[PDB]
Design an enzyme around this catalytic site. Structure first.
Site, PDB file in Angstrom:
ATOM      1  N   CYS A 109       0.833  -1.209   0.000  1.00 38.62           N
ATOM      2  CA  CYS A 109       0.000   0.000   0.000  1.00 38.62           C
ATOM      3  C   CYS A 109       0.866   1.257   0.000  1.00 38.62           C
ATOM      4  O   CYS A 109       1.584   1.526   0.968  1.00 38.62           O
ATOM      5  CB  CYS A 109      -0.939   0.018   1.209  1.00 38.62           C
ATOM      6  SG  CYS A 109      -1.950   1.537   1.360  1.00 38.62           S
ATOM      7  N   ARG A 112      -0.096   4.511   2.848  1.00 36.79           N
ATOM      8  CA  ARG A 112      -0.126   4.207   4.280  1.00 36.79           C
ATOM      9  C   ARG A 112       0.149   5.403   5.176  1.00 36.79           C
ATOM     10  O   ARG A 112       0.009   5.274   6.400  1.00 36.79           O
ATOM     11  CB  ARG A 112       0.882   3.106   4.608  1.00 36.79           C
ATOM     12  CG  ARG A 112       0.402   1.733   4.191  1.00 36.79           C
ATOM     13  CD  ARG A 112       1.398   0.696   4.566  1.00 36.79           C
ATOM     14  NE  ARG A 112       2.466   0.608   3.580  1.00 36.79           N
ATOM     15  CZ  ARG A 112       3.590  -0.066   3.791  1.00 36.79           C
ATOM     16  NH1 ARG A 112       3.771  -0.667   4.958  1.00 36.79           N
ATOM     17  NH2 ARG A 112       4.538  -0.132   2.857  1.00 36.79           N
ATOM     18  N   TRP A 281      -9.110   6.458  -0.848  1.00 37.64           N
ATOM     19  CA  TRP A 281      -9.369   7.178  -2.087  1.00 37.64           C
ATOM     20  C   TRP A 281      -8.407   6.674  -3.151  1.00 37.64           C
ATOM     21  O   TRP A 281      -7.413   6.020  -2.846  1.00 37.64           O
ATOM     22  CB  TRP A 281      -9.228   8.704  -1.925  1.00 37.64           C
ATOM     23  CG  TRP A 281      -8.031   9.139  -1.169  1.00 37.64           C
ATOM     24  CD1 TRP A 281      -6.757   9.296  -1.661  1.00 37.64           C
ATOM     25  CD2 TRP A 281      -7.966   9.468   0.221  1.00 37.64           C
ATOM     26  NE1 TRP A 281      -5.912   9.708  -0.660  1.00 37.64           N
ATOM     27  CE2 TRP A 281      -6.626   9.822   0.506  1.00 37.64           C
ATOM     28  CE3 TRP A 281      -8.907   9.497   1.257  1.00 37.64           C
ATOM     29  CZ2 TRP A 281      -6.206  10.195   1.784  1.00 37.64           C
ATOM     30  CZ3 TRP A 281      -8.491   9.874   2.522  1.00 37.64           C
ATOM     31  CH2 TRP A 281      -7.156  10.216   2.778  1.00 37.64           C
ATOM     32  N   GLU A 286      -4.450   3.947 -10.820  1.00 35.38           N
ATOM     33  CA  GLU A 286      -5.231   2.713 -10.818  1.00 35.38           C
ATOM     34  C   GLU A 286      -6.380   2.792 -11.799  1.00 35.38           C
ATOM     35  O   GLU A 286      -6.746   1.787 -12.413  1.00 35.38           O
ATOM     36  CB  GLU A 286      -5.797   2.403  -9.453  1.00 35.38           C
ATOM     37  CG  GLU A 286      -4.836   2.236  -8.325  1.00 35.38           C
ATOM     38  CD  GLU A 286      -5.684   2.161  -7.031  1.00 35.38           C
ATOM     39  OE1 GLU A 286      -6.395   1.130  -6.850  1.00 35.38           O
ATOM     40  OE2 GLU A 286      -5.713   3.157  -6.268  1.00 35.38           O
TER      41      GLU A 286
HETATM   42  C1  HEM Z   1      -6.091   6.439   2.169  1.00 31.40           C
HETATM   43  C2  HEM Z   1      -5.965   6.330   0.844  1.00 31.40           C
HETATM   44  C3  HEM Z   1      -5.345   5.065   0.220  1.00 31.40           C
HETATM   45  C4  HEM Z   1      -4.605   5.064  -0.897  1.00 31.40           C
HETATM   46  C5  HEM Z   1      -4.191   6.276  -1.762  1.00 31.40           C
HETATM   47  C6  HEM Z   1      -4.206   3.706  -1.160  1.00 31.40           C
HETATM   48  C7  HEM Z   1      -3.431   3.331  -2.228  1.00 31.40           C
HETATM   49  C8  HEM Z   1      -3.229   2.039  -2.639  1.00 31.40           C
HETATM   50  C9  HEM Z   1      -2.863   1.597  -3.971  1.00 31.40           C
HETATM   51  C10 HEM Z   1      -2.608   2.499  -5.202  1.00 31.40           C
HETATM   52  C11 HEM Z   1      -2.758   0.267  -3.946  1.00 31.40           C
HETATM   53  C12 HEM Z   1      -2.399  -0.616  -5.164  1.00 31.40           C
HETATM   54  C13 HEM Z   1      -3.742  -1.253  -5.526  1.00 31.40           C
HETATM   55  C14 HEM Z   1      -3.586  -2.216  -6.659  1.00 31.40           C
HETATM   56  O1  HEM Z   1      -2.724  -1.948  -7.540  1.00 31.40           O
HETATM   57  O2  HEM Z   1      -4.324  -3.232  -6.682  1.00 31.40           O
HETATM   58  C15 HEM Z   1      -3.070  -0.189  -2.593  1.00 31.40           C
HETATM   59  C16 HEM Z   1      -3.090  -1.489  -2.104  1.00 31.40           C
HETATM   60  C17 HEM Z   1      -3.475  -1.879  -0.816  1.00 31.40           C
HETATM   61  N1  HEM Z   1      -4.152  -1.080   0.115  1.00 31.40           N
HETATM   62 FE1  HEM Z   1      -3.962   0.901   0.207  1.00 31.40          FE
HETATM   63  N2  HEM Z   1      -4.755   2.889  -0.165  1.00 31.40           N
HETATM   64  C18 HEM Z   1      -5.480   3.699   0.704  1.00 31.40           C
HETATM   65  C19 HEM Z   1      -6.194   3.273   1.820  1.00 31.40           C
HETATM   66  C20 HEM Z   1      -6.140   1.997   2.345  1.00 31.40           C
HETATM   67  C21 HEM Z   1      -6.847   1.503   3.513  1.00 31.40           C
HETATM   68  C22 HEM Z   1      -7.834   2.374   4.340  1.00 31.40           C
HETATM   69  C23 HEM Z   1      -6.523   0.207   3.655  1.00 31.40           C
HETATM   70  C24 HEM Z   1      -6.936  -0.821   4.720  1.00 31.40           C
HETATM   71  C25 HEM Z   1      -7.309  -0.432   5.941  1.00 31.40           C
HETATM   72  C26 HEM Z   1      -5.567  -0.147   2.612  1.00 31.40           C
HETATM   73  C27 HEM Z   1      -4.977  -1.388   2.424  1.00 31.40           C
HETATM   74  C28 HEM Z   1      -4.338  -1.820   1.279  1.00 31.40           C
HETATM   75  C29 HEM Z   1      -3.785  -3.131   1.061  1.00 31.40           C
HETATM   76  C30 HEM Z   1      -3.809  -4.251   2.136  1.00 31.40           C
HETATM   77  C31 HEM Z   1      -3.255  -3.166  -0.190  1.00 31.40           C
HETATM   78  C32 HEM Z   1      -2.532  -4.354  -0.873  1.00 31.40           C
HETATM   79  C33 HEM Z   1      -3.484  -5.537  -0.971  1.00 31.40           C
HETATM   80  C34 HEM Z   1      -3.995  -5.595  -2.369  1.00 31.40           C
HETATM   81  O3  HEM Z   1      -4.523  -4.551  -2.838  1.00 31.40           O
HETATM   82  O4  HEM Z   1      -3.823  -6.679  -3.007  1.00 31.40           O
HETATM   83  N3  HEM Z   1      -5.376   0.972   1.843  1.00 31.40           N
HETATM   84  N4  HEM Z   1      -3.346   0.932  -1.832  1.00 31.40           N
HETATM   85  C1  LIG Z   2      -8.139   1.068  -0.034  1.00 25.94           C
HETATM   86  C2  LIG Z   2      -7.722   1.221  -1.483  1.00 25.94           C
HETATM   87  C3  LIG Z   2      -7.136   2.391  -1.950  1.00 25.94           C
HETATM   88  C4  LIG Z   2      -6.795   2.507  -3.297  1.00 25.94           C
HETATM   89  N1  LIG Z   2      -6.215   3.641  -3.766  1.00 25.94           N
HETATM   90  N2  LIG Z   2      -7.012   1.473  -4.142  1.00 25.94           N
HETATM   91  C5  LIG Z   2      -7.560   0.312  -3.686  1.00 25.94           C
HETATM   92  C6  LIG Z   2      -7.838  -0.821  -4.607  1.00 25.94           C
HETATM   93  C7  LIG Z   2      -7.328  -2.107  -4.412  1.00 25.94           C
HETATM   94  C8  LIG Z   2      -7.693  -3.063  -5.351  1.00 25.94           C
HETATM   95  C9  LIG Z   2      -7.275  -4.487  -5.296  1.00 25.94           C
HETATM   96  N3  LIG Z   2      -5.972  -4.753  -4.722  1.00 25.94           N
HETATM   97  C10 LIG Z   2      -5.882  -6.192  -4.991  1.00 25.94           C
HETATM   98  C11 LIG Z   2      -5.829  -6.430  -6.486  1.00 25.94           C
HETATM   99  F1  LIG Z   2      -5.992  -7.775  -6.651  1.00 25.94           F
HETATM  100  C12 LIG Z   2      -8.522  -2.774  -6.416  1.00 25.94           C
HETATM  101  C13 LIG Z   2      -9.018  -1.505  -6.588  1.00 25.94           C
HETATM  102  F2  LIG Z   2      -9.821  -1.215  -7.629  1.00 25.94           F
HETATM  103  C14 LIG Z   2      -8.662  -0.542  -5.680  1.00 25.94           C
HETATM  104  F3  LIG Z   2      -9.118   0.697  -5.844  1.00 25.94           F
HETATM  105  C15 LIG Z   2      -7.933   0.171  -2.360  1.00 25.94           C
END
Ligand code: HEM
Ligand SMILES: Cc1cc(N)nc(-c2cc(CNCCF)cc(F)c2F)c1
Ligand SMILES: C[C@H](O)[C@H](O)[C@H]1CNc2nc(N)[nH]c(=O)c2N1
Ligand SMILES: [Zn+2]
Length: 411
Positions: A109, A112, A281, A286
């Site tokens: 993430c 964070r 957000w 993405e």
């Molecule tokens: C606050 C704004 C946030 C932003 C800008 C953000 C941004 C991102 C982005 C760009 C990714 C890559 C997603 C992908 O390529 O699939 C990601 C993955 C992830 N986000 Fe964050 N996120 C946010 C909030 C959160 C919150 C609130 C949580 C959980 C409490 C979280 C947990 C995770 C986890 C566990 C992953 C990796 C797991 C996965 O997506 O496979 N995020 N995040």
């Molecule tokens: C909390 C949060 C913030 C952010 N910026 N993106 C995501 C986000 C994550 C995923 C899946 N991640 C596992 C892919 F197999 C897919 C999305 F379409 C999202 F938008 C979630």
């Protein structure tokens, strides 16, 4: 043993000691590295008290009362409840701590830096799919906040025997539908075509268009899941226009404001929460790079290239690259002009370096997965490209879990 990570843009070095608290495993060995494998690799009461103990010790350390009378009794108490029930229950305080720290520890993430600003909705009193729908609705509405998005998580009852799991079958609370065509090709989101057929299998009447918002498929206490459609007024969408190319609107694209992952497993003190949807957000890319331009997703490089009149005859003309930069200026501009919260891949990767600086300062490290932290475009003109990162698994943590329709015992 107490390793160094360097930044090759700034010559800055930081020492990582937090990795000694690493518990889980990575998949890499001394002889192979798997850091580009996407998803590598019942729970009894013997194993459960160690995990509960380690969690309770870091939580009491956290509130600066490590080992006090409170910590002692809360340990004896949890041990007794694991004798009695072969499991235990988190205090509300411990639930909010565990949740914020599963985020904090999410090495993939980039966002964070906000890990401590997280709203935890305790849904552990929920008993029905209908109650799940209700809990999910107030989560959507609260975290959307008129486009001024807010980070949130809704935590449903923890897993017990294993056949009484609460699962959101959706992969994200809000996704667009997937329909292939008579001619084979696909309308909507090709990512979702199997899921869309499942919803239709359970009687979803498909509006067979493009940006059709899928309904919630909610399984409660191990029961067969049931369809509920999020009230449309609760689903905020942003229409994508460009600040220059007025033919952009004719493309007719749009995306939902709220990214909300619903298919993952939350782990706290060795207790397992199979339904724990969480939202933040969007980072611009993405949508602009992955959703819109993945070959197996919306795949719009074809058209955006045309309407600019680019040299598509030659691969080396970089028409794909140019059309990708325009698309991402338009996503950002559309979101910003409606006051819907969004971050651009420069501003967010810079915050992550700052966040990384703080984590190494007041925690001794920061798990990080370079393969996932680097944005999917303009890689090395963002500072995270240049930053060595140590990946390792801490707990509390978010984990992957199999799709529920492969496991569910069904009638
Ligand atoms: C606050 C704004 C946030 C932003 C800008 C953000 C941004 C991102 C982005 C760009 C990714 C890559 C997603 C992908 O390529 O699939 C990601 C993955 C992830 N986000 Fe964050 N996120 C946010 C909030 C959160 C919150 C609130 C949580 C959980 C409490 C979280 C947990 C995770 C986890 C566990 C992953 C990796 C797991 C996965 O997506 O496979 N995020 N995040
Ligand atoms: C909390 C949060 C913030 C952010 N910026 N993106 C995501 C986000 C994550 C995923 C899946 N991640 C596992 C892919 F197999 C897919 C999305 F379409 C999202 F938008 C979630
Ligand atoms: C093969 C590789 O593991 C896979 O493409 C990963 C690479 N990095 C990624 N990074 C993010 N943020 N999101 C992804 O889906 C992926 N996919
Ligand atoms: Zn490795």
């Amino acid at each position: 043993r107490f390793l160094k990570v360097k930044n090759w843009e700034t010559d800055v070095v930081l020492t990582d000691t937090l990795h000694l608290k690493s518990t889980l495993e990575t998949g890499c060995t001394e002889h192979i590295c798997m850091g580009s494998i996407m998803l590598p690799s019942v729970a009894t009461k013997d194993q459960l008290f160690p995990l509960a103990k380690e969690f309770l010790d870091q939580y009491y350390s956290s509130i600066k009362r490590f080992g006090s009378k409170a910590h002692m009794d809360r340990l004896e108490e949890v041990n007794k409840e694991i004798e009695s029930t072969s499991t235990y229950q988190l205090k509300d305080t411990e639930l909010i701590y565990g949740a914020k720290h599963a985020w904090r520890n999410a090495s993939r993430c980039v966002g964070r830096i906000q890990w401590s600003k997280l709203q935890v909705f305790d849904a552990r009193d929920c008993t029905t799919a209908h109650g799940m729908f209700n809990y999910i609705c107030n989560h959507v509405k609260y975290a959307t906040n008129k486009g001024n998005l807010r980070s949130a998580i809704t935590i449903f009852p923890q897993r017990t025997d294993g056949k009484h799991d609460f699962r959101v079958w959706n992969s994200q609370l809000i996704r667009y539908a997937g329909y292939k065509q008579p001619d084979g090709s696909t309308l909507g989101d090709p990512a979702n075509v199997q899921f869309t057929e499942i919803c239709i299998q359970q009687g979803w009447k498909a509006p067979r268009g493009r940006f059709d918002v899928l309904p919630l498929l909610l399984q409660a206490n191990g029961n067969d899941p049931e369809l509920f459609q999020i009230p449309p007024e609760l689903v905020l969408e942003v229409p994508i226009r460009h600040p220059k190319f007025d033919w952009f609107k004719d493309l007719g694209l749009k995306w939902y404001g709220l990214p909300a992952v619903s298919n993952m497993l939350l782990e706290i003190g060795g207790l397992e929460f199979s339904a724990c949807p969480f939202s933040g957000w969007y980072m611009g890319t993405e949508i602009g790079v992955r959703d819109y331009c993945d070959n197996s997703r919306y795949n719009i490089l074809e058209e955006v290239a045309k309407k600019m009149d680019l040299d598509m005859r030659k691969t080396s003309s970089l028409w794909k690259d140019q059309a990708l930069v325009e698309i991402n200026i338009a996503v950002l501009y559309s979101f910003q002009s409606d006051k819907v919260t969004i971050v651009d891949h420069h501003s967010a990767t810079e915050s992550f370096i700052k966040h990384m600086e703080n984590e190494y300062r007041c925690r001794g490290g920061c798990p990080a997965d370079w393969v996932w932290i680097v944005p999917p475009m303009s890689g090395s003109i963002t500072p995270v490209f240049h930053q060595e990162m140590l990946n390792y698994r801490l707990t509390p943590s978010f984990e992957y879990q199999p799709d529920p329709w492969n496991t569910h015992v069904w009638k």
